[PDB]
Design a protein around this ligand. Structure first.
Ligand code: HEM
Ligand SMILES: COc1cccc(Br)c1O
Length: 137
């Protein structure tokens, strides 16, 4: 289930973080509006840059902390507030997060690895609603 999925992801965190973020960027080409340094590079060209894996891995580390602290796939309001108030997230809207989790769930369902894709869809939806409640537009 969801708890095991956190363990699966953490067990190979850098690789999953890169592949899920790439799935997001490729599903939503307009979303590079927030990623000017990744324009004009293929998936393997991006994975070849240490800064890409370094940043993705730190992103998904925090995502796994928020997922692990959630109750029944409902994130804590304090974690949502953290994500809202991060300087790196100024100008984001919940639509940015909605698209990330749509791509993440799609990646999981296409994967050979078992994932509880329903729980991740719920987690993404509850994260969006919590981000809104914490003041994200
Ligand atoms: C639960 C979802 C997310 C989590 C846990 C998260 C977490 C993080 C973390 C930890 C960093 C700092 C990483 C580092 O040290 O390099 C970061 C940076 C950033 N994040 Fe998020 N993020 C999430 C969703 C998003 C989404 C959906 C977007 C936009 C579509 C976004 C845009 C950015 C940007 C632009 C930066 C700055 C990159 C830079 O210039 O260093 N994040 N995020
Ligand atoms: C490059 O790493 C990321 C940067 C911003 C948002 C997400 Br999600 C990432 O995985």
């Amino acid at each position: 289930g969801f708890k095991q999925d956190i363990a699966t992801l953490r067990g190979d965190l850098r690789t999953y973080a890169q592949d899920i973020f790439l799935a997001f960027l490729n599903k939503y080409p307009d979303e590079k509006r927030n990623f000017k340094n990744y324009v004009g590079k293929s998936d393997q060209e991006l994975k070849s840059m240490a800064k890409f894996g370094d940043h993705t891995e730190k992103v998904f580390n925090l995502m796994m902390e928020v997922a692990d602290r959630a109750t029944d796939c409902v994130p804590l309001a304090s974690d949502a507030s953290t994500l809202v108030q991060m300087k790196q997230h100024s100008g984001l809207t919940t639509g940015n997060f909605e698209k990330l989790f749509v791509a993440l769930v799609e990646y999981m369902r296409a994967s050979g690895q078992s994932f509880d894709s329903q729980s991740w869809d719920r987690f993404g939806k509850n994260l969006v609603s919590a981000l809104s409640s914490a003041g994200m537009k």
